[PDB]
CSV table of N, CA and C and ligand atoms in Angstrom, one decimal:
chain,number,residue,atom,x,y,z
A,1,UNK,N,0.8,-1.2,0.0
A,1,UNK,CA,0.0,0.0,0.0
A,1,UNK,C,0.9,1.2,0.0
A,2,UNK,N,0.7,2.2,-1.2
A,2,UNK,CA,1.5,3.6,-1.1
A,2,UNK,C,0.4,4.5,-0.4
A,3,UNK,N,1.1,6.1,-1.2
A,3,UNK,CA,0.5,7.2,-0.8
A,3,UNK,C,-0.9,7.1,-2.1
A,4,UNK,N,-2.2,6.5,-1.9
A,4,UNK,CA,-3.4,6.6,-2.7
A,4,UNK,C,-3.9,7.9,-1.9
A,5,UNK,N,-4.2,7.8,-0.7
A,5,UNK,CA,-5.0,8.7,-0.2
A,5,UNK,C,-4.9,10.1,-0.7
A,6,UNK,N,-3.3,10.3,-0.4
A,6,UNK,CA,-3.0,11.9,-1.0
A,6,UNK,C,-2.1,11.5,-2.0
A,7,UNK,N,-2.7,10.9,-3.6
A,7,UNK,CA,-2.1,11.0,-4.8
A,7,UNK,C,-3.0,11.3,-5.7
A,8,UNK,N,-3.6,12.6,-6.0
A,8,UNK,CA,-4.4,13.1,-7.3
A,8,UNK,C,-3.6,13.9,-7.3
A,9,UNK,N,-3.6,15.2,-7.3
A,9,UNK,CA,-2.7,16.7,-7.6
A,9,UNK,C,-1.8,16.8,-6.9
A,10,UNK,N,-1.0,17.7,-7.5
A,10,UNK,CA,0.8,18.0,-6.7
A,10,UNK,C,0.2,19.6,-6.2
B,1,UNK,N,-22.2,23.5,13.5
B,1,UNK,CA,-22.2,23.5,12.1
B,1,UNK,C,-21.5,21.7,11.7
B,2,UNK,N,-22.8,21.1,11.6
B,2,UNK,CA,-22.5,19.8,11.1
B,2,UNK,C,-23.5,18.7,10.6
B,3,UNK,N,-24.4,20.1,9.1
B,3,UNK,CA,-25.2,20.1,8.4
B,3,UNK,C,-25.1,18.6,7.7
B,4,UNK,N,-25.1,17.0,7.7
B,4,UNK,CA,-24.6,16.4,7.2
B,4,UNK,C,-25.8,16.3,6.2
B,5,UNK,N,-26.4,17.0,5.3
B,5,UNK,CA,-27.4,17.0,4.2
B,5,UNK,C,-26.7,16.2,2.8
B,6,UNK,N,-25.4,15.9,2.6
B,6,UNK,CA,-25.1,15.2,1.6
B,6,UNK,C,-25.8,13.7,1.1
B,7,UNK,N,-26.0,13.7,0.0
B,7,UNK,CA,-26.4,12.3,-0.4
B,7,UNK,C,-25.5,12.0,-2.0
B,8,UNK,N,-25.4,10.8,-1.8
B,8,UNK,CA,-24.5,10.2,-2.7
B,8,UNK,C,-25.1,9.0,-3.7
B,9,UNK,N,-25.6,9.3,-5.1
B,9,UNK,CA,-26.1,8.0,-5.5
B,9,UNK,C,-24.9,7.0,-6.3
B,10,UNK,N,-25.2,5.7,-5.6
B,10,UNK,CA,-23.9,4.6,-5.2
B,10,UNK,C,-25.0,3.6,-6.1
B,11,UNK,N,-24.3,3.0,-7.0
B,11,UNK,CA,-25.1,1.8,-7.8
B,11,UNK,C,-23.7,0.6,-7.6
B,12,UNK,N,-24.4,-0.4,-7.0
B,12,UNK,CA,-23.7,-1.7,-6.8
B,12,UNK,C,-24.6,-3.1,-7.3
B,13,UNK,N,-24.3,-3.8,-8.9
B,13,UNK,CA,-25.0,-4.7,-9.1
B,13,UNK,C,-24.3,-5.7,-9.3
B,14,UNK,N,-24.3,-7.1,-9.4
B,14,UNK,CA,-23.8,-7.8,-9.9
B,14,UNK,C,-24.0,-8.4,-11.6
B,15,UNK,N,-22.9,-8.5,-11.9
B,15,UNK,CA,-23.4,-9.0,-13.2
B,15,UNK,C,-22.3,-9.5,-14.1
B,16,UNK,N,-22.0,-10.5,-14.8
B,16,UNK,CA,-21.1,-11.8,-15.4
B,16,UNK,C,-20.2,-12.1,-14.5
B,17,UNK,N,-20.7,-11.9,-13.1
B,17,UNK,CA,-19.7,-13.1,-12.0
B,17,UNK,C,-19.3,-11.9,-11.3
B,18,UNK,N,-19.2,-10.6,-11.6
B,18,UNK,CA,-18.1,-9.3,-11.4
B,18,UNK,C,-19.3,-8.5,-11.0
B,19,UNK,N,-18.3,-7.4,-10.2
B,19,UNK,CA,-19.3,-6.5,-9.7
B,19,UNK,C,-19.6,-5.3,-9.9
B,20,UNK,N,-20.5,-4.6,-10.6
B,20,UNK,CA,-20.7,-3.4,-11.6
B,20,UNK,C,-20.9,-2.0,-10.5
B,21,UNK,N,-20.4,-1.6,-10.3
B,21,UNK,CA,-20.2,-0.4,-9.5
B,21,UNK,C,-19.9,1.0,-10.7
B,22,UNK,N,-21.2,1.8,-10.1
B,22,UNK,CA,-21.7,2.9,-10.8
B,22,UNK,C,-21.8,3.9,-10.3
B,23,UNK,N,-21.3,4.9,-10.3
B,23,UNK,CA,-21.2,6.1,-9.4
B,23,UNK,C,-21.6,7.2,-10.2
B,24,UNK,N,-23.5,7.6,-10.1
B,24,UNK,CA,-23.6,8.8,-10.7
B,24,UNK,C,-23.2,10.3,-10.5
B,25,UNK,N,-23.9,10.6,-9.3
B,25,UNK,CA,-23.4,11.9,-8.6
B,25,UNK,C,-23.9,12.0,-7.2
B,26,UNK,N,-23.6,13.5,-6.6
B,26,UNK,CA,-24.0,13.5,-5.5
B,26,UNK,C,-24.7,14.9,-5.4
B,27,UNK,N,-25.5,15.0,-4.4
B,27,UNK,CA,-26.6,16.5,-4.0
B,27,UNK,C,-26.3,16.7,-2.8
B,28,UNK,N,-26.7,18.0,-2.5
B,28,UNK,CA,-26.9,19.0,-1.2
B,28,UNK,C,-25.3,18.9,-0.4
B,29,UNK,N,-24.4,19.1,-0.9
B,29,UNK,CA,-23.4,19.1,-0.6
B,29,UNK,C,-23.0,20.1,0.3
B,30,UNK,N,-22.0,20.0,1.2
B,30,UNK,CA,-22.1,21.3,2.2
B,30,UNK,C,-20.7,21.4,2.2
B,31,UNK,N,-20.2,23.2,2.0
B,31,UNK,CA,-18.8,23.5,2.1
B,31,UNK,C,-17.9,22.6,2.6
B,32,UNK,N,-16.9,22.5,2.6
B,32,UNK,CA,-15.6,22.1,3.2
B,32,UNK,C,-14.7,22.4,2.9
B,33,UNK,N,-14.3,23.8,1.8
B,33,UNK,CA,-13.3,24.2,1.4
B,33,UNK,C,-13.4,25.7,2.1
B,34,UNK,N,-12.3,26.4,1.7
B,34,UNK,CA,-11.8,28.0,2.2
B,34,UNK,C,-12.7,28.5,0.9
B,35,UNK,N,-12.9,28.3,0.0
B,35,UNK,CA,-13.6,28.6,-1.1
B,35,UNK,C,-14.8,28.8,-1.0
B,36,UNK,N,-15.3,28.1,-0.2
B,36,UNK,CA,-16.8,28.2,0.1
B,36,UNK,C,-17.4,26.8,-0.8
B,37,UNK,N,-17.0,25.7,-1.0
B,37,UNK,CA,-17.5,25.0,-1.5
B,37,UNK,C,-16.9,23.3,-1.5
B,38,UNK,N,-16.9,22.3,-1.9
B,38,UNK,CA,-16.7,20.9,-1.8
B,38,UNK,C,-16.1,20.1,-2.9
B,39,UNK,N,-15.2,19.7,-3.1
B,39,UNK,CA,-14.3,19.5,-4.5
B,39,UNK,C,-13.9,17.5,-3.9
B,40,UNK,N,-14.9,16.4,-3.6
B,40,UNK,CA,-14.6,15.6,-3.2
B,40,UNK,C,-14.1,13.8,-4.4
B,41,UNK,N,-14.2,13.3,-4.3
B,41,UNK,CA,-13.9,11.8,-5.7
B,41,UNK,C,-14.4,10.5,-4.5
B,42,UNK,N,-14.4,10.0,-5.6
B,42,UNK,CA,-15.0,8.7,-5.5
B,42,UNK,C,-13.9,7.5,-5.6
B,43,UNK,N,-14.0,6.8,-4.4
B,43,UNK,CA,-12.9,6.2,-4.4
B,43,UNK,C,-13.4,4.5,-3.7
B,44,UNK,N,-13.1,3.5,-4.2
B,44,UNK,CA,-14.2,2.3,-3.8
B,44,UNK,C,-12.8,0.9,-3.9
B,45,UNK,N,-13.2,0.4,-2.9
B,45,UNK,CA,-11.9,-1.1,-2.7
B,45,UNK,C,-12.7,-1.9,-2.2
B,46,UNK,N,-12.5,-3.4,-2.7
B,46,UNK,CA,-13.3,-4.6,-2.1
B,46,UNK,C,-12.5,-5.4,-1.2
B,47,UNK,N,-12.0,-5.2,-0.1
B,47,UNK,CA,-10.8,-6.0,0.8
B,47,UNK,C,-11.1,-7.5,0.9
B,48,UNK,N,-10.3,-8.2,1.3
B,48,UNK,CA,-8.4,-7.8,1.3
B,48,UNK,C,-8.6,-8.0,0.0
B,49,UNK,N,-7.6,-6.5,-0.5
B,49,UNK,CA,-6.7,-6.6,-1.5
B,49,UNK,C,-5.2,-6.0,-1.0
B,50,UNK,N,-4.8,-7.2,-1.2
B,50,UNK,CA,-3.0,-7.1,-1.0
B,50,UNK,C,-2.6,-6.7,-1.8
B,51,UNK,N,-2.6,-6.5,-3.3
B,51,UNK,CA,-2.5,-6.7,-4.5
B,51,UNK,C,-2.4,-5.5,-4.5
B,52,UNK,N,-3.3,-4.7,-4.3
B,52,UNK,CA,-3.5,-3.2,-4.5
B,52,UNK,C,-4.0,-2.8,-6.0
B,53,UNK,N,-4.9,-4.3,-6.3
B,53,UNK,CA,-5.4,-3.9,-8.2
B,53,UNK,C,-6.9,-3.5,-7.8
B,54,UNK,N,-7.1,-4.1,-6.8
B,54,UNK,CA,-8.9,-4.2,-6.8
B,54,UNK,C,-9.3,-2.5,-6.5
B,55,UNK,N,-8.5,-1.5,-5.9
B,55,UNK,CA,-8.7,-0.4,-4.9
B,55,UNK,C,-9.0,0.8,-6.5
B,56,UNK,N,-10.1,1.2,-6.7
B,56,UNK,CA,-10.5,1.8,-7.7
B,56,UNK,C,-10.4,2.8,-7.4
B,57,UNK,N,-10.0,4.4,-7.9
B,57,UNK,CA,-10.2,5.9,-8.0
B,57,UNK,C,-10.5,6.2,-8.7
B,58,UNK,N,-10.6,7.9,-8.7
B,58,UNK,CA,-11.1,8.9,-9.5
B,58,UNK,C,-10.9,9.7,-9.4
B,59,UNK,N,-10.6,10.9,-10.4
B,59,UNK,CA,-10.1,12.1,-9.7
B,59,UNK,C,-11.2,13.5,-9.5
B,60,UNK,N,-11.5,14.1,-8.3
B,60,UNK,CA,-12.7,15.1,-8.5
B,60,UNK,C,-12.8,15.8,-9.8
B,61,UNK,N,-14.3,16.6,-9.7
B,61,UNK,CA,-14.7,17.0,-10.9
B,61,UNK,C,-14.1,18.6,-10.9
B,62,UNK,N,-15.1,19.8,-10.1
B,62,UNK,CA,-14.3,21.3,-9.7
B,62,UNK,C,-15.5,21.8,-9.0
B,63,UNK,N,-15.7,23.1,-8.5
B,63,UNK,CA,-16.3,23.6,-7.9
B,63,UNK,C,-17.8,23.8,-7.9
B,64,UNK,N,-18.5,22.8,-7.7
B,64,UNK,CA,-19.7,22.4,-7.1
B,64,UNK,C,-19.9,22.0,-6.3
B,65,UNK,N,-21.8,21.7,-5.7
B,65,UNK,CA,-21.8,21.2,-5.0
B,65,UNK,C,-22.5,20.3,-5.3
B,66,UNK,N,-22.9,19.6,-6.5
B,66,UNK,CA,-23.3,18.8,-7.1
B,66,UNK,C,-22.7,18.4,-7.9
B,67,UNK,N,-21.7,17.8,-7.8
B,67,UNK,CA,-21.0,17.2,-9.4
B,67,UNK,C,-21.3,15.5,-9.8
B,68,UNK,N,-20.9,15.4,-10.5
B,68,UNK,CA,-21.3,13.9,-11.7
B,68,UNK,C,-20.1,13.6,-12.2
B,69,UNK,N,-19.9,11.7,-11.9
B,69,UNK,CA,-18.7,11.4,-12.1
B,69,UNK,C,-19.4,10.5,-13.6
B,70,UNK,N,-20.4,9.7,-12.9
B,70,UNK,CA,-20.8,8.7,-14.1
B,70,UNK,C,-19.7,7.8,-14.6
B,71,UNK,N,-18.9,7.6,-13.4
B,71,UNK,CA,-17.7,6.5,-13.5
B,71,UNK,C,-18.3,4.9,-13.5
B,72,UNK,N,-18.2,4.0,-14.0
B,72,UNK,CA,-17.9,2.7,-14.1
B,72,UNK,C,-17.2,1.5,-13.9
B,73,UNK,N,-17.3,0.7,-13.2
B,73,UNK,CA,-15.9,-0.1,-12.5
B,73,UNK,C,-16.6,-1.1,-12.6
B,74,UNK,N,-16.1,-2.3,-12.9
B,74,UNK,CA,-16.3,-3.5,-12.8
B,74,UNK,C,-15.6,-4.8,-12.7
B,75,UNK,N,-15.6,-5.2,-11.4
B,75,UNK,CA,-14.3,-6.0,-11.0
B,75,UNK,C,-15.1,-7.2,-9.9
B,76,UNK,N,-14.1,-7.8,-9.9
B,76,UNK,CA,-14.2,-9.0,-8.0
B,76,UNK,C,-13.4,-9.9,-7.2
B,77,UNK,N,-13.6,-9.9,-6.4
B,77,UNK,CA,-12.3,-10.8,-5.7
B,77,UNK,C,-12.6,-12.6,-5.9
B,78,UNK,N,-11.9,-13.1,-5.1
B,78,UNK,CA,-11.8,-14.3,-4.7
B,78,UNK,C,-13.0,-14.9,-4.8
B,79,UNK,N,-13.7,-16.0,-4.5
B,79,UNK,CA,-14.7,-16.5,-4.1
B,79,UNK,C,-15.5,-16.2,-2.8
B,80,UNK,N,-14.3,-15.9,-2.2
B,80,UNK,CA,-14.3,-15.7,-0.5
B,80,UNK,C,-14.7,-14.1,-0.1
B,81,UNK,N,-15.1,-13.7,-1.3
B,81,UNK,CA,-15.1,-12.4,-1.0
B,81,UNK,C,-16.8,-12.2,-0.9
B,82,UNK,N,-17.5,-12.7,-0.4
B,82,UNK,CA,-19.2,-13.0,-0.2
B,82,UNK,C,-19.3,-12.1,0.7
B,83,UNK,N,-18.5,-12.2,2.2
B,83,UNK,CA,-18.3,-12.5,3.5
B,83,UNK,C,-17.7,-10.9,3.3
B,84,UNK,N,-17.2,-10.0,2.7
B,84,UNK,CA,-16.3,-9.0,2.1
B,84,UNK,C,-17.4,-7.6,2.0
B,85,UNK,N,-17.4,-6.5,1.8
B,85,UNK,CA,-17.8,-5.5,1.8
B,85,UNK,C,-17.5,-4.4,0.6
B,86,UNK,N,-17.8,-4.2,0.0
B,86,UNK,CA,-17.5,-3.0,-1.3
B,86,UNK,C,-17.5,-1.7,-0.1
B,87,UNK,N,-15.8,-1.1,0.0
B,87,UNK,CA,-16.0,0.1,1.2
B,87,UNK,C,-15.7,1.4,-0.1
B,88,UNK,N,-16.5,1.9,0.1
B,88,UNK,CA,-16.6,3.2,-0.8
B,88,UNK,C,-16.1,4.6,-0.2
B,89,UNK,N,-14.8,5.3,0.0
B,89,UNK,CA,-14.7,6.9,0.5
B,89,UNK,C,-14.7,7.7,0.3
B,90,UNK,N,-15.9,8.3,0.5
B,90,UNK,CA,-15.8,9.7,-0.2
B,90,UNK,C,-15.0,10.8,0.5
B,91,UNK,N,-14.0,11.1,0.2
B,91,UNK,CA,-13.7,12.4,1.4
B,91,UNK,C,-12.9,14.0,0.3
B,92,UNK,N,-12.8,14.5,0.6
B,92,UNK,CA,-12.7,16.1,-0.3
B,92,UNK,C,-11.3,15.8,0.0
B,93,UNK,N,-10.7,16.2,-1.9
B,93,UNK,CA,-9.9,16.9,-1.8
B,93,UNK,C,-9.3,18.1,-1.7
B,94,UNK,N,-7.9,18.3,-1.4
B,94,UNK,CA,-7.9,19.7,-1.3
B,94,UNK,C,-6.1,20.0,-2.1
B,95,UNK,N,-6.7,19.7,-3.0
B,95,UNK,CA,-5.4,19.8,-4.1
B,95,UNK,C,-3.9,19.5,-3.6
B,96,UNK,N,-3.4,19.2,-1.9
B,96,UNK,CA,-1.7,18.8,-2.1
B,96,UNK,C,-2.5,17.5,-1.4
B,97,UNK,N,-3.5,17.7,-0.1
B,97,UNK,CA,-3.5,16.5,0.4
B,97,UNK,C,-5.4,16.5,1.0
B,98,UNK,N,-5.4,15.2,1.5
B,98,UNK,CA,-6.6,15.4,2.1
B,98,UNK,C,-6.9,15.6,3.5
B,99,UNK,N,-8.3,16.3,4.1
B,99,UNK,CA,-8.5,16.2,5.4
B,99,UNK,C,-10.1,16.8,6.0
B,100,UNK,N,-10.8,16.3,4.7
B,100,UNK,CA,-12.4,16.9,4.9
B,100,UNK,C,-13.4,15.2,4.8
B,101,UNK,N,-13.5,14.6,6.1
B,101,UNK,CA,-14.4,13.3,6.3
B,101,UNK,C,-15.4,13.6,5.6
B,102,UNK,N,-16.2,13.4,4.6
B,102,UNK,CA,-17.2,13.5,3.9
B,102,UNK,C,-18.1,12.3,4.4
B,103,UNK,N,-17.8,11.0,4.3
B,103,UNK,CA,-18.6,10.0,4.4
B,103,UNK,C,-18.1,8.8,3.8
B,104,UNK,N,-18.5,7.6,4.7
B,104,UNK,CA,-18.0,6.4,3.8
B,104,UNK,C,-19.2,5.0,4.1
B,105,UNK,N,-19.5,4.3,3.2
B,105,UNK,CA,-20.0,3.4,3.4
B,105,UNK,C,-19.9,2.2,2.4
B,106,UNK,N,-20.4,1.3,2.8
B,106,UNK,CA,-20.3,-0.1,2.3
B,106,UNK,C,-21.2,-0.9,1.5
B,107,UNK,N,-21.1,-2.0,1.0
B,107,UNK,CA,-21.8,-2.9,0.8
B,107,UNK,C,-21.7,-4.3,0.6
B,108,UNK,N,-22.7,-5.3,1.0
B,108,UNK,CA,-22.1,-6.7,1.2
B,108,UNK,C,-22.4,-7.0,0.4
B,109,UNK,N,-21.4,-7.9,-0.3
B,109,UNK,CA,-21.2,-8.7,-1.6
B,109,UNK,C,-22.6,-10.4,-1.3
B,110,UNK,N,-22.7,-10.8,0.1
B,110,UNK,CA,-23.4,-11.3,0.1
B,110,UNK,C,-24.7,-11.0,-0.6
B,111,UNK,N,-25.2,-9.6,0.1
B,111,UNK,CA,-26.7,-9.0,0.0
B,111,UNK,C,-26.7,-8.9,-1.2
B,112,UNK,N,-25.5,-8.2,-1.7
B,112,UNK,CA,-25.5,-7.9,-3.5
B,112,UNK,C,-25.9,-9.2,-4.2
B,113,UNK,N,-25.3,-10.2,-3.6
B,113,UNK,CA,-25.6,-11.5,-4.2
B,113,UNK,C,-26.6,-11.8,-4.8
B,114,UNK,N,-27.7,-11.6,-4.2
B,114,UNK,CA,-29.2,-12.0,-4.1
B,114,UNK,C,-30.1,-10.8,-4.3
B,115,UNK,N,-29.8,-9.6,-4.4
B,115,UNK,CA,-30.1,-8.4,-4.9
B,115,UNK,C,-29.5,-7.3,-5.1
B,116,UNK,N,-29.4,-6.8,-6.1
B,116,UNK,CA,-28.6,-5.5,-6.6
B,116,UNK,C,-28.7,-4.3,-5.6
B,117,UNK,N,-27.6,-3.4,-5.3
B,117,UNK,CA,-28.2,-2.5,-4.5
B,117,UNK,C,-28.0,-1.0,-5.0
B,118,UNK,N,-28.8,-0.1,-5.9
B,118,UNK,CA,-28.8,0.9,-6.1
B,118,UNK,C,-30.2,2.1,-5.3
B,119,UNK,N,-29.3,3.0,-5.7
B,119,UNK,CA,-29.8,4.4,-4.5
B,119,UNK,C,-28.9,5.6,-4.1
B,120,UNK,N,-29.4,5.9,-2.8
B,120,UNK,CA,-29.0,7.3,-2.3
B,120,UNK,C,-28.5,7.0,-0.9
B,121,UNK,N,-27.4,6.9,-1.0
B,121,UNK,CA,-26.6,7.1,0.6
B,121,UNK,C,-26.3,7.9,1.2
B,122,UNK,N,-26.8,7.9,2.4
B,122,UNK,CA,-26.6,9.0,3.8
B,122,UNK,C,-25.0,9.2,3.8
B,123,UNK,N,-24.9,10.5,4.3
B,123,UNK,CA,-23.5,10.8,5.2
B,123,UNK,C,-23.6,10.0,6.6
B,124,UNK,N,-22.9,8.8,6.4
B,124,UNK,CA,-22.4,7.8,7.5
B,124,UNK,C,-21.1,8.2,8.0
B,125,UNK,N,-20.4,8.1,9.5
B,125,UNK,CA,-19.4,7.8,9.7
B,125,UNK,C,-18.7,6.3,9.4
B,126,UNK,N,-17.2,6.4,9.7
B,126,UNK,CA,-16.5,5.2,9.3
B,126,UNK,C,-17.0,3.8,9.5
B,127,UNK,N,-17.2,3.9,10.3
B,127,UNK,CA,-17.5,2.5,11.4
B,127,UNK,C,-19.1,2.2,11.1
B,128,UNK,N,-19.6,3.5,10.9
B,128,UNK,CA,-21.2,3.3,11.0
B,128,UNK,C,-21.3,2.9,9.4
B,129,UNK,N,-20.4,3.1,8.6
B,129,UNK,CA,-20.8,2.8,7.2
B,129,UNK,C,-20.0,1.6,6.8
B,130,UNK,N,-18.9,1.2,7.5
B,130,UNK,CA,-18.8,0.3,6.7
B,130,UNK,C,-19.3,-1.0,7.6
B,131,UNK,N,-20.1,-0.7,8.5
B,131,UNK,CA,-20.4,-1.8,9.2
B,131,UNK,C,-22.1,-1.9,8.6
B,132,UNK,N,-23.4,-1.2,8.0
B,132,UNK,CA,-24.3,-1.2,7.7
B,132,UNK,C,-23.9,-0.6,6.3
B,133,UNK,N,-25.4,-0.8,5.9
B,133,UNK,CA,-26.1,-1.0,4.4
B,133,UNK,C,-27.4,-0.8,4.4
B,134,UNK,N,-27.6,1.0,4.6
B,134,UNK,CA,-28.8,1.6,4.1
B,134,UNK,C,-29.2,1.9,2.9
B,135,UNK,N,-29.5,2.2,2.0
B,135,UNK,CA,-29.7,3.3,1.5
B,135,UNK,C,-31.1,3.5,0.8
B,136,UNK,N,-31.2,4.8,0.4
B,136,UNK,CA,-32.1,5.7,0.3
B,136,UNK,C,-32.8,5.7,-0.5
B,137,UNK,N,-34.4,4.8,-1.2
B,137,UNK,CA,-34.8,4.3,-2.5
B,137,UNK,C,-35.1,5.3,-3.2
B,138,UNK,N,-35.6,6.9,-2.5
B,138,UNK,CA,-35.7,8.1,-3.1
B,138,UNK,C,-36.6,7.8,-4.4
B,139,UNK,N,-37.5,6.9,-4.6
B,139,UNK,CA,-38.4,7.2,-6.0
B,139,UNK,C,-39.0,6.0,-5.8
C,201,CA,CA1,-11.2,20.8,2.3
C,202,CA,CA1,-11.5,20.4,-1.3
């Protein structure tokens, strides 16, 4: 498990 | 101030063995930005996934409080996954990271089994949603 939660926009 | 008026329509059916997950949109959405408004995605996993393939996203739409994703997923686990829950989270983004609880809830692959489950889901907390399976027949 990565960073999904906070991985949409930079 | 903890207006929880949001509703979420969540379509969970089964169909060629896989599970059709359909996310139209959502109403009455209440601020949670500095903007004055709610910029949240739709984000749905069928556990355990170790694998990290089954865990579906999306990325928000923009500044409403009604937006439409009209996304489609269709996937399923193991056999063993009856017993398993479709956990759905909706929570707002906020463009570097997140931190606005919107709502999350579930559904049992059992119940799906034997009947499709589409509708309008309440703003549930964590626990209260992924442990129950209301929703809202609204028509
Ligand atoms: Ca926010
Ligand atoms: Ca936001």
């Amino acid at each position: 498990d990565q960073s999904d939660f906070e991985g949409f926009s930079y | 101030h903890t207006e929880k008026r949001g509703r979420i329509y969540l379509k969970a059916e089964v169909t060629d063995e896989k599970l059709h997950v359909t996310v139209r949109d959502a109403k009455n959405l209440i601020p949670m930005d500095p903007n004055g408004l709610s910029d949240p995605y739709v984000k749905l996993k069928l556990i355990p996934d170790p694998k990290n393939e089954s865990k579906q996203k999306t990325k928000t739409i923009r500044s409403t409080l009604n937006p439409q994703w009209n996304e489609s997923f269709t996937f399923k686990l193991k056999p063993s996954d009856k017993d398993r829950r479709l956990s759905v989270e909706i929570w707002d983004w906020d463009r570097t990271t997140r931190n606005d609880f919107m709502g999350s809830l579930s559904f049992g692959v059992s119940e799906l089994m034997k009947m499709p489950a589409s509708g309008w889901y309440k703003l549930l907390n964590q626990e209260e949603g992924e442990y129950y399976n209301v929703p809202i027949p609204e028509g």
